[PDB]
Amino acid sequence: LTKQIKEIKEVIELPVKHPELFESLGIAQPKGVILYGPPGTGKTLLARAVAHHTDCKFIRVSGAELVQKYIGEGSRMVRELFVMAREHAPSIIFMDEIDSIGSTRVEGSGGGDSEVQRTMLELLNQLDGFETSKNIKIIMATNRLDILDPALLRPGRIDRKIEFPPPSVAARAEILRIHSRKMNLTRGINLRKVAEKMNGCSGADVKGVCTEAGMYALRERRIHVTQEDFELAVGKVMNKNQETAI
Amino acid sequence: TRCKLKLLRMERIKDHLLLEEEFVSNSEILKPFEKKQEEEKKQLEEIRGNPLSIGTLEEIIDDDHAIVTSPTMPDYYVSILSFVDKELLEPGCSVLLHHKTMSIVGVLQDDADPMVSVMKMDKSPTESYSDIGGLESQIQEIKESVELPLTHPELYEEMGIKPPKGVILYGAPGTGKTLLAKAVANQTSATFLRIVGSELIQKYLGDGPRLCRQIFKVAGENAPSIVFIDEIDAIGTKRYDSNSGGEREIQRTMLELLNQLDGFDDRGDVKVIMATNKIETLDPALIRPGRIDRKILFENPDLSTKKKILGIHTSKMNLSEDVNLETLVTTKDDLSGADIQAMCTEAGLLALRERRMQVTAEDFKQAKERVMKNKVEENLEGLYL
Amino acid sequence: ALMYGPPGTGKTLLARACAAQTNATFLKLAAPQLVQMYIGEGAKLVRDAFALAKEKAPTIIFIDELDAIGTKRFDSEKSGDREVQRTMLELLNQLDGFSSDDRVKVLAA
Amino acid sequence: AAPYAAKLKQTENDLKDIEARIKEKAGVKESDTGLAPSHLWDIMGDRQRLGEEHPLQVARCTKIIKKYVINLKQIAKFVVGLGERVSPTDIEEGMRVGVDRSKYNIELPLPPRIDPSVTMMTVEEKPDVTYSDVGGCKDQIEKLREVVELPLLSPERFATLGIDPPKGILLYGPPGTGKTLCARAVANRTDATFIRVIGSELVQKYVGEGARMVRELFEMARTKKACIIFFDEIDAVGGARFDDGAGGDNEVQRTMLELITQLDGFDPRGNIKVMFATNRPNTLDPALLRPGRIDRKVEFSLPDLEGRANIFRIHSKSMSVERGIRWELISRLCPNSTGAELRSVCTEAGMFAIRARRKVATEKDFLKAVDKVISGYKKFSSTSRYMQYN
Amino acid sequence: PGTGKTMLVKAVANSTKAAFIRVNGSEFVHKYLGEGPRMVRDVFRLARENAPSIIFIDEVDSIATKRFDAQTGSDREVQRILIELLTQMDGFDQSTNVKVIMATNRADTLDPALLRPGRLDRKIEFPSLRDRRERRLIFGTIA
Amino acid sequence: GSRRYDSRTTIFSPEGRLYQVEYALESISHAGTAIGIMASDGIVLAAERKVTSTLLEQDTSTEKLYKLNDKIAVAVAGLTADAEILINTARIHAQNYLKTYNEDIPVEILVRRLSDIKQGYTQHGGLRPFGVSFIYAGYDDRYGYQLYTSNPSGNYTGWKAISVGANTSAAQTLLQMDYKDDMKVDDAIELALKTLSKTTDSSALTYDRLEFATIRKGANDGEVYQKIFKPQEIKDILVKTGIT
Amino acid sequence: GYDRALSIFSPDGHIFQVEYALEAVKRGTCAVGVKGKNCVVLGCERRSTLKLQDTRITPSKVSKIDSHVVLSFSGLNADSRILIEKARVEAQSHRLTLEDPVTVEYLTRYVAGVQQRYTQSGGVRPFGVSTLIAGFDPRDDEPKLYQTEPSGIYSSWSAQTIGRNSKTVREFLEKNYDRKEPPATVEECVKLTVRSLLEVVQTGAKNIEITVVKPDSDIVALSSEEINQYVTQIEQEKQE
Numbered sequence A: 001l002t003k004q005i006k007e008i009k010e011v012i013e014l015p016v017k018h019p020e021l022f023e024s025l026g027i028a029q030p031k032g033v034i035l036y037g038p039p040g041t042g043k044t045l046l047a048r049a050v051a052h053h054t055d056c057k058f059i060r061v062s063g064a065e066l067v068q069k070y071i072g073e074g075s076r077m078v079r080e081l082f083v084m085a086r087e088h089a090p091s092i093i094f095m096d097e098i099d100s101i102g103s104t105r106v107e108g109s110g111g112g113d114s115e116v117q118r119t120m121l122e123l124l125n126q127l128d129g130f131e132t133s134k135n136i137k138i139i140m141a142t143n144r145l146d147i148l149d150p151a152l153l154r155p156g157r158i159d160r161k162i163e164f165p166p167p168s169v170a171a172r173a174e175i176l177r178i179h180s181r182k183m184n185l186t187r188g189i190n191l192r193k194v195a196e197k198m199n200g201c202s203g204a205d206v207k208g209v210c211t212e213a214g215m216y217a218l219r220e221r222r223i224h225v226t227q228e229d230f231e232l233a234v235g236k237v238m239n240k241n242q243e244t245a246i
Numbered sequence B: 001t002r003c004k005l006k007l008l009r010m011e012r013i014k015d016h017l018l019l020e021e022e023f024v025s026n027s028e029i030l031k032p033f034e035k036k037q038e039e040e041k042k043q044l045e046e047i048r049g050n051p052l053s054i055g056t057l058e059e060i061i062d063d064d065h066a067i068v069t070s071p072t073m074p075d076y077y078v079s080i081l082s083f084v085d086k087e088l089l090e091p092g093c094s095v096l097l098h099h100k101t102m103s104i105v106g107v108l109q110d111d112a113d114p115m116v117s118v119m120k121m122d123k124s125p126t127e128s129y130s131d132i133g134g135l136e137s138q139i140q141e142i143k144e145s146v147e148l149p150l151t152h153p154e155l156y157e158e159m160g161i162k163p164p165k166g167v168i169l170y171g172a173p174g175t176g177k178t179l180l181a182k183a184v185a186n187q188t189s190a191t192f193l194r195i196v197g198s199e200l201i202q203k204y205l206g207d208g209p210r211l212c213r214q215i216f217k218v219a220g221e222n223a224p225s226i227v228f229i230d231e232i233d234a235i236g237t238k239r240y241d242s243n244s245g246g247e248r249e250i251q252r253t254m255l256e257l258l259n260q261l262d263g264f265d266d267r268g269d270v271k272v273i274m275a276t277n278k279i280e281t282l283d284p285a286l287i288r289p290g291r292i293d294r295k296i297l298f299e300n301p302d303l304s305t306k307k308k309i310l311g312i313h314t315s316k317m318n319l320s321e322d323v324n325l326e327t328l329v330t331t332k333d334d335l336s337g338a339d340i341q342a343m344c345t346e347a348g349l350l351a352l353r354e355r356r357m358q359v360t361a362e363d364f365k366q367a368k369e370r371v372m373k374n375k376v377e378e379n380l381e382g383l384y385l
Numbered sequence C: 001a002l003m004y005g006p007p008g009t010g011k012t013l014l015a016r017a018c019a020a021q022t023n024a025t026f027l028k029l030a031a032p033q034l035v036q037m038y039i040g041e042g043a044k045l046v047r048d049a050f051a052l053a054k055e056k057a058p059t060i061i062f063i064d065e066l067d068a069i070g071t072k073r074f075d076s077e078k079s080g081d082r083e084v085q086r087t088m089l090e091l092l093n094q095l096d097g098f099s100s101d102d103r104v105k106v107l108a109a
Numbered sequence D: 001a002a003p004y005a006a007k008l009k010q011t012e013n014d015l016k017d018i019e020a021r022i023k024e025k026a027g028v029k030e031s032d033t034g035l036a037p038s039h040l041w042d043i044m045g046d047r048q049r050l051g052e053e054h055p056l057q058v059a060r061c062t063k064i065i066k067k068y069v070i071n072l073k074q075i076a077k078f079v080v081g082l083g084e085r086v087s088p089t090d091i092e093e094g095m096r097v098g099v100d101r102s103k104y105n106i107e108l109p110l111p112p113r114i115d116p117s118v119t120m121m122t123v124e125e126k127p128d129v130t131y132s133d134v135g136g137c138k139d140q141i142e143k144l145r146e147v148v149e150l151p152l153l154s155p156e157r158f159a160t161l162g163i164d165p166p167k168g169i170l171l172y173g174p175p176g177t178g179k180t181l182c183a184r185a186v187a188n189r190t191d192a193t194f195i196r197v198i199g200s201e202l203v204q205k206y207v208g209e210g211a212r213m214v215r216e217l218f219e220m221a222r223t224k225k226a227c228i229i230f231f232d233e234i235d236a237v238g239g240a241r242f243d244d245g246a247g248g249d250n251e252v253q254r255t256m257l258e259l260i261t262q263l264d265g266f267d268p269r270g271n272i273k274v275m276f277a278t279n280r281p282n283t284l285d286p287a288l289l290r291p292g293r294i295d296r297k298v299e300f301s302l303p304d305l306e307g308r309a310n311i312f313r314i315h316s317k318s319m320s321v322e323r324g325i326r327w328e329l330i331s332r333l334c335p336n337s338t339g340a341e342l343r344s345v346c347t348e349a350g351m352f353a354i355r356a357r358r359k360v361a362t363e364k365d366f367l368k369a370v371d372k373v374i375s376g377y378k379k380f381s382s383t384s385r386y387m388q389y390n
Numbered sequence E: 001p002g003t004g005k006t007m008l009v010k011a012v013a014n015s016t017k018a019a020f021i022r023v024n025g026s027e028f029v030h031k032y033l034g035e036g037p038r039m040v041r042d043v044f045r046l047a048r049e050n051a052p053s054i055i056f057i058d059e060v061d062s063i064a065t066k067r068f069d070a071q072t073g074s075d076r077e078v079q080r081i082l083i084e085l086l087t088q089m090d091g092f093d094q095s096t097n098v099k100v101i102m103a104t105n106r107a108d109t110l111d112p113a114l115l116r117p118g119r120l121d122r123k124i125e126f127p128s129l130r131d132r133r134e135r136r137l138i139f140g141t142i143a
Numbered sequence F: 001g002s003r004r005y006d007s008r009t010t011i012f013s014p015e016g017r018l019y020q021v022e023y024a025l026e027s028i029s030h031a032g033t034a035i036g037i038m039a040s041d042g043i044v045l046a047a048e049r050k051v052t053s054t055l056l057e058q059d060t061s062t063e064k065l066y067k068l069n070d071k072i073a074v075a076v077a078g079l080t081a082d083a084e085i086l087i088n089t090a091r092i093h094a095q096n097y098l099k100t101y102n103e104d105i106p107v108e109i110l111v112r113r114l115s116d117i118k119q120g121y122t123q124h125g126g127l128r129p130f131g132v133s134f135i136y137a138g139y140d141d142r143y144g145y146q147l148y149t150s151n152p153s154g155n156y157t158g159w160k161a162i163s164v165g166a167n168t169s170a171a172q173t174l175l176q177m178d179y180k181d182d183m184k185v186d187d188a189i190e191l192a193l194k195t196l197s198k199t200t201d202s203s204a205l206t207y208d209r210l211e212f213a214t215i216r217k218g219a220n221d222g223e224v225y226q227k228i229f230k231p232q233e234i235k236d237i238l239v240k241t242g243i244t
Numbered sequence G: 001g002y003d004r005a006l007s008i009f010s011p012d013g014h015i016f017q018v019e020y021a022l023e024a025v026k027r028g029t030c031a032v033g034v035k036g037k038n039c040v041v042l043g044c045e046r047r048s049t050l051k052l053q054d055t056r057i058t059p060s061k062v063s064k065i066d067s068h069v070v071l072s073f074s075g076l077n078a079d080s081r082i083l084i085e086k087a088r089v090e091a092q093s094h095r096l097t098l099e100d101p102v103t104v105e106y107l108t109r110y111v112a113g114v115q116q117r118y119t120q121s122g123g124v125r126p127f128g129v130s131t132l133i134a135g136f137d138p139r140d141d142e143p144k145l146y147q148t149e150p151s152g153i154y155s156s157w158s159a160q161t162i163g164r165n166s167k168t169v170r171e172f173l174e175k176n177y178d179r180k181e182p183p184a185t186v187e188e189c190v191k192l193t194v195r196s197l198l199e200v201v202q203t204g205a206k207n208i209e210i211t212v213v214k215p216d217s218d219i220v221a222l223s224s225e226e227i228n229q230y231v232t233q234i235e236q237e238k239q240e
């Protein structure tokens, strides 16, 4: 997903690296950046990547109240996260609508995970004296944009909307190679021909072809990941995905 | 400059001199400090020593005795000794105990809480009144209720009329319900507590009233105060389904908010701002005129008003001479002031992708067109004509 | 015996007459006091009440408003309380015969 | 420049040295008093530290054995004797007692109850909204006085007939009719301890804890001498019972059932009058309503035309108004209204006078205000929906 | 419930010829104090000592619950047991030890802090559905 | 009795609006897009289907274009089920007028008649309103070519080019910049396809997912021939105008 | 049948379906009526937000009931046509049986009586329309101008306005219309009605429609050019 790296660099990376470009023009700071697409197309992976390059803290909040033991609660927490965020800033608060664990919160509210997004966005438009330039951005992830209620799509509320298409046959080849660099190869293997044959739909699936190829390496006690292993792997991964997805 | 330094120089060496005179001639007289003073501080410290055990005063008995609870389990019928204000000790208060034989040797404790800090805004918004382009009439219904009785409490007391209490800022989205709250919160320099209406639904049962009783107690202590409740619409309309008390729970919490707002308490000075976008949903008991006094209403900015709004966002901006402000106003026909702000922000972003400081005429025309498509008309007044 | 009917006909009154006239031991109990928020402290109270009733035998236990030990009809997978439930089922084992139910009569209203 | 840049440093050292003199005189460490009566208190605390009035470890009795069975808080039980301070007549069942630090012996009986820390917070300091402020000379005021005020004021007159006085009043009516206003008025008048509880605060987190709170409230009242407990806004905790079959009203009615049972007891309960104020009687359960727990229903309803004339006089008498105000004229022009709209009327009459730069409110200004209040807020009238639940 | 989760683990206890430590999920709840943390700390050390070793918690479900009140004492004591397990699960890395193998017949209530990567990784499925071939195979061995 | 179960689909709201007619507008915003363009010498009706799988035989299928007589065609956007009902009441009223005056029905009568049927259900009856919106393209000698849209309120107004269905706003703004009054039937076709090409959800635009029908005066003797295109004329006209 | 009692009294003594009906008339476009010495002039707001909309074939806001009675309206456009159908019917029915065209006051009494009927019939919601019925009685030149409303009550006015921003227009007509002396002629009256409208339309020559009705069955609509001319004059007059 090469195009998407360039669009989120604009709104997130640049106002941290240069708070002067945004003062000079007279442009308001960007706040929210909403990421949406099919799971596995890597909307989280890009998030971790931008945080590392700018050099900001990455605070993942899942909506769970269990992990909170120092405050005690995530029940009345909104600003109580920000108190901890302001000590360790610059920060990127991350929130993901999982809608498969905690599916009963989504109901009847445009996301019960969006209660977290809107309340935290409200404190962030006007807080303290970070009106000159803010050191906390806010990033929201949703499988689908359908769920988000209109009070998060108004003009001026977010600032950027990233879309992630499922990978093309060209993209699959690149993504399959990043996972193959970690493990052995054999001369003559065309990682391109295995991406085409694999219909697929996700990059999560693609990573499972590599791990499954390593499983076929153990049973025969090979010394190298060979061309036969990928053909068996593609099948095992595709058949398991089609029985659960249909 | 000249005279302010000159008078300070005389006052600050005259202060020096008087403090030296009081110190020398109250140390040679034993009836004031001297002999009692150098023995009480050393004795008080030494006798009780350390560790001082913190506990909680469970309740106080009128006879200078108390029942205090150590976290280590043993309760104690203690006595209340030297160097403590006995009116300051009340249920809930934390006390310091003398560890050899348990007696309250005092409370030195601020007892600062994250419960008071969460309500509190350290606000310094760059917004002041007249960053609201026009809608001047509406500004001067809000200032007469909230700000003015703090500036001149003389006018209402001469007249003999009780100040108006409460306001509701409602209307179409984008008319600046939040932007007005920020203007009026900046001027007053009263304690401005902020609490979004969504927070009043939480998962546990019966916590809603405990949370609602807490907010107003911080405010009454900090008079004069403002309590802004942003989108109190949110509790009626939504159903987060985290709270397993269901709809019954939301109703019992609402009834708590009604009592804290007027009820029996007879609280101190607490103005309330209630922002909402849909006044229909709101329970009719809340809106009732007696708790709120004036219901301000807004409407969609006009074509003459939109010129004022645009002038505010285009002033900060750098422009070329090729831009024409007037052709950006007329094309849009009835579009709120939130969209005008985004139209400026979108243009400056296109010019920053091309990497030229100036925002030319073309960046404005591409931005304006993109913002009309993003909107969604209004099938409420389309039905009509 | 059970007493059921419209409020105000005097179910509580009638039990009060019986207490003063029979000069048997009369153990007043109220069904909401029995329910307790601690985990299983409400069960311990039922067994202690019937055990005291053996010593003072013969006895009458008059329970008021049995609606606080309500009805068992829940089985949801989301919450369900299941506290009131436990102390009600402890009450049934003392009404059973293992515990002598011939020294102890129960007036339910 | 230099003569004052160097002397500005000099005066900052001379002030830091003046802070040391002021710290030394009073000390200001372990201080929490005016440092004048605490000198004498210092010698008094030396005599109490030597005496063993304290510490006394606080315990509670579990069974009197004709000898006692005491339980300490650190959970370990003891059989104790008797103190030379006290008679055995004063040691009772369940009572809190202080025992020696060492060999545990009963010293002093203590007043009961450890829950008092929410319900003690609502023993009122009695505000004053005088009885004049109540509108007119209504019958409704006189039916409250026969319940609360008269049996405390003059028990001579009730003794002859032999009537035992009623106890319960139910105040009910559309919002803004002054249900609460009267409550505050009888709060000072009465002079008995006045405890107001909000109906939402009885709802607790745990199954069975809401029943405790309301149970100890009454126990405390019986100890005090003559009480009035004012249950405000008990729509919450009051809803008739149902069983959805899925969750039920189980946690709410656990509280509601405890309240019913101490207003008929299995015993006569103490001198306790109870006032209920709701915005809907619809909600309330048939067990709360019948006489003996809510003897007299009194309706606070919209005032008729003559009522609205007296309630204009009670808000306006502080106001400066001209002589030519015909309050009959603007009461006739005001339709059917609650007393809460009439406050906003007068506030807005005074409001238009401050905008106009006039010190005295005129006839023109009062008409504008009536127009503004009823026109706009007839759209937001609480009165129409809530009158139907009645 | 009832597909042969435990019975597949019995077989594995015989064949391995590596130490094997078998704990119910209720040995970790103590009644006194801090003893929950004290059970976890011992169990992982004991594995490392006689390595290579398999730890099996029959049912870990009550300890790995998803929701905590964090007011009642009981909950505040389970949180400590669950933090320790997560901490020493990453310490197990770079030993011959194979990590804890554990079963639960519930999957919705699990704490997702266990199923993050670097801790519990591989998820086994046991179906309820039986096709015709796989059914005959079970009948064959019992009969 | 019956009152408990009653929805009441005819009351006013607290603000002087009809909720139930508003909601009918909402369900029309999910259905497929339909566009009509008025040239000097004809009318283009072009509609995008909501179905697109290949098992479906879209070739003989018509669910968007209907002829009401031999001079007035309509396009549909909404519930296709509901729409067939109003079309037979229109077909019948179009014919009654030809029976009694021996003269083809004016476009103004046939549109005003359908509107009042829809109005009818929100006035009384307690039935749920209709969930349909029509574009009428028709020809009459009084005004030449005419175009009219009606919605579930019953309010209809004429247009030069209009669009109902998904992204009504977006489709209207693209047309507004390009449309000109000197357009011929060739020019209009090219603007209609291009505008559907920019709004379609799928980036690819195929001949099979488009329905298309015109009304041209190039039929001899001062007459008008309505043709609903075959799938082989659409295919050739998609390669001609360079959309693929 | 379907006969639910949709319209009932509330305890405040207003029917809530009728108050709701009258709020619906407020959001409507604005229509103004002013009667001169011997003409009436009906000025109406055209929603011009719309673009690419043909004005040749689009129904206007002034619909002739007879050849000397015109009717204008504010509110729901759809429901309005239902009154105008029963009105055109009533005008020919009265010509048939008594002879003589309808007098303006009678044609209102019928139309006002229909709006009243639909506030008692069970199963029917009230109308969301208020009208201005204007014109000249036959064989007379007294101008007449009436207003009905969804309560069913009707009144004659010297000038009136219904619809959105009506308070601002009505205030201008209470200062600029002398009750004793009408606009001298037909030309002065048009200049009084345009000048009232230009306060709330915030100009646009295309936005404003003017229909003048004169005695003796002379209905004419002022063309765009004429309107433009008047606006430019008033703007230039007022500007000067």
Ligand SMILES: Nc1ncnc2c1ncn2[C@@H]1O[C@H](COP(=O)(O)OP(=O)(O)OP(=O)(O)O)[C@@H](O)[C@H]1O
Pocket: A151, A156, B131, B132, B133, B134, B135, B172, B173, B174, B175, B176, B177, B178, B179, B180, B277, B309, B312, B337, B338, B339, B341
């Ligand atoms: N009347 C106005 N004048 C100038 N700027 C305005 C005006 N209204 C809105 N804005 C601009 O739009 C921004 C967002 O407005 P705001 O948050 O007040 O909208 P809102 O109406 O409160 O939305 P919501 O319906 O979500 O409450 C403001 O920060 C301000 O810059």
Ligand SMILES: Nc1ncnc2c1ncn2[C@@H]1O[C@H](COP(=O)(O)OP(=O)(O)OP(=O)(O)O)[C@@H](O)[C@H]1O
Pocket: B262, B263, B285, B290, D133, D134, D135, D174, D175, D176, D177, D178, D179, D180, D181, D182, D279, D311, D314, D339, D340, D343
């Ligand atoms: N009978 C009255 N006479 C004078 N003033 C009144 C009267 N009734 C109400 N008011 C005024 O209205 C205000 C609000 O009334 P109050 O707080 O008693 O409401 P309430 O009757 O409790 O209704 P709710 O509880 O629904 O708000 C009072 O503070 C008082 O100023």
Ligand SMILES: Nc1ncnc2c1ncn2[C@@H]1O[C@H](COP(=O)(O)OP(=O)(O)O)[C@@H](O)[C@H]1O
Pocket: A001, A038, A039, A040, A041, A042, A043, A044, A045, A046, A175, A178, A202, A203, A204, A207
């Ligand atoms: N385009 C990609 N390039 C590289 N790795 C990918 C890509 N898409 C998916 N993956 C792999 O799949 C994993 C799961 O995706 P994740 O980042 O959790 O986001 P999401 O599950 O929301 O799509 C990634 O961590 C990564 O290892």
Ligand SMILES: [Mg+2]
Pocket: A043, A044, A096, A141
């Ligand atoms: Mg993700």
Ligand SMILES: [Mg+2]
Pocket: B177, B178
């Ligand atoms: Mg806002």
Ligand SMILES: [Mg+2]
Pocket: C011, C012, C013, C064, C109
């Ligand atoms: Mg009874």
Ligand SMILES: [Mg+2]
Pocket: B263, D179, D180
């Ligand atoms: Mg009240």
Ligand SMILES: [Mg+2]
Pocket: E005, E006, E058, E103
């Ligand atoms: Mg098992």
